[PDB]
Amino acid sequence: MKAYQREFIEFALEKQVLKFGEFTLKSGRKSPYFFNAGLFNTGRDLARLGRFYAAALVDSGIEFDVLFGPAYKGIPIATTTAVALADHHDVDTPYCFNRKENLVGSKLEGRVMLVDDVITAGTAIRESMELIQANKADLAGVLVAIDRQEKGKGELSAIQEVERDFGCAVISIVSLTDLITYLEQQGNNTEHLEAVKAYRAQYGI
Amino acid sequence: MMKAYQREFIEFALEKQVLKFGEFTLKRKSPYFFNAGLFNTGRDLARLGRFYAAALVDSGIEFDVLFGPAYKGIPIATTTAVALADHHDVDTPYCFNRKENLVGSKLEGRVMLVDDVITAGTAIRESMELIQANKADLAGVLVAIDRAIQEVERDFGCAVISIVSLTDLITYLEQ
Ligand SMILES: [Cl-]
């Protein structure tokens, strides 16, 4: 995986946004991990998050003319991503978000990149799509923080349903698979820990 | 004289024509106009948080949570928190409301609100009532510009501050 994906995971772990262990999901299943981007709730958590969404966006190479964040959760995420693009990528993108009710910022025109936290059932995307549709712009992509890569009600994932229903690509910072790589790519900790302690014991303090 | 950040903010806000001086009518009259909703690019937003952050640091007001009223306060609070963290090493909990309820960090201690103009009365007062109803205190409200304020200041017991003043705007346009 690339550097930003590794640094995202570590950051999510540091902030307790990502956690491993036993977890009962409010949506049936028992899961081995918990992920809740809502815990990125301070100014430095947001700065970093804008920068990780921005990195993921530039990595995809998808061209977009406006970054749209749906009310309400998409608003801060679009905001910090837009900021990360101006200051760290020298990309000055128009940005837009809606009021529930009607548009703040730029016009919804051309290729629209929707940014949000997660794709649960595709709800926020459906209302937004009706705004894009209405404005005769098209949905070029949706960017979320994590792609869980698991079957839903049927056989397609929640992301795959969004792709089918709206015709856009879904972009994620990271995926279940990255979480496995990350875990599989760890330097046998207790092995090195003991050797480091042993080396210390003989040369320490 | 006005500080560097104050001069730079006026210059910024005038270029984008988001800030205007003249004679305007609100739904009552005003000598200035400012609608942060007119900023339309990420670079605008970037510069915006930095000016709010500079104002907030300069004010020396202590606060535990940065709050943004729906809807315009939300991107303002977000980018202001990003700037605080990035440029001033101040990592502040943030929160905002759904006009619809709260999103972000738990609302506790002293809460500083940020928004574009104070004639954003109804949105700010409600946010303010909502903060209080949640047992947190009000540190103050920071707007981009002012001289309305009197009212909020009387019945909520907190200060209303701004990045710049009407005087600074008029002085700027003289120089
Ligand atoms: Cl608003």
UniProtKB/Swiss-Prot annotation, chain A:
Pfam families: Pribosyltran. Orotate binds at F34, F35, T120, R148. It catalyses: orotidine 5'-phosphate + diphosphate = orotate + 5-phospho-alpha-D-ribose 1-diphosphate. 5-phospho-alpha-D-ribose 1-diphosphate binds at K26, Y72, K73, R99, K100, D116, D117, V118, I119, T120, A121, G122, T123, A124. The keyword DNA damage does not apply. Pathway: Pyrimidine metabolism; UMP biosynthesis via de novo pathway; UMP from orotate: step 1/2. The keyword Transferase applies. GO terms for cellular component: cytoplasm. GO terms for molecular function: magnesium ion binding; orotate phosphoribosyltransferase activity. Keywords: Glycosyltransferase, Magnesium, Pyrimidine biosynthesis, Transferase. Its cofactor is Mg(2+). One of its GO terms (biological process) is 'de novo' pyrimidine nucleobase biosynthetic process. It is an enzyme of class 2 (transferase). Its EC number is 2.4.2.10. Belongs to the purine/pyrimidine phosphoribosyltransferase family. PyrE subfamily. Homodimer. Catalyzes the transfer of a ribosyl phosphate group from 5-phosphoribose 1-diphosphate to orotate, leading to the formation of orotidine monophosphate (OMP). This is Orotate phosphoribosyltransferase. It comes from Vibrio cholerae serotype O1 (strain ATCC 39315 / El Tor Inaba N16961). The lineage of its organism: Bacteria, Pseudomonadati, Pseudomonadota, Gammaproteobacteria, Vibrionales.
Curated annotation (Swiss-Prot), chain B:
InterPro entries: OPRT, Or_phspho_trans_dom, PRibTrfase_dom, PRTase-like. One of its GO terms (cellular component) is cytoplasm. Keywords: Glycosyltransferase, Magnesium, Pyrimidine biosynthesis, Transferase. PROSITE patterns: PUR_PYR_PR_TRANSFER. Orotate binds at F33, F34, T119, R147. Pathway: Pyrimidine metabolism; UMP biosynthesis via de novo pathway; UMP from orotate: step 1/2. The keyword rRNA processing does not apply. GO terms for molecular function: magnesium ion binding; orotate phosphoribosyltransferase activity. Its EC number is 2.4.2.10. Gene3D superfamilies: 3.40.50.2020. It is an enzyme of class 2 (transferase). Belongs to the purine/pyrimidine phosphoribosyltransferase family. PyrE subfamily. Homodimer. Catalyzes the transfer of a ribosyl phosphate group from 5-phosphoribose 1-diphosphate to orotate, leading to the formation of orotidine monophosphate (OMP). This is Orotate phosphoribosyltransferase. It comes from Vibrio cholerae serotype O1 (strain ATCC 39315 / El Tor Inaba N16961).
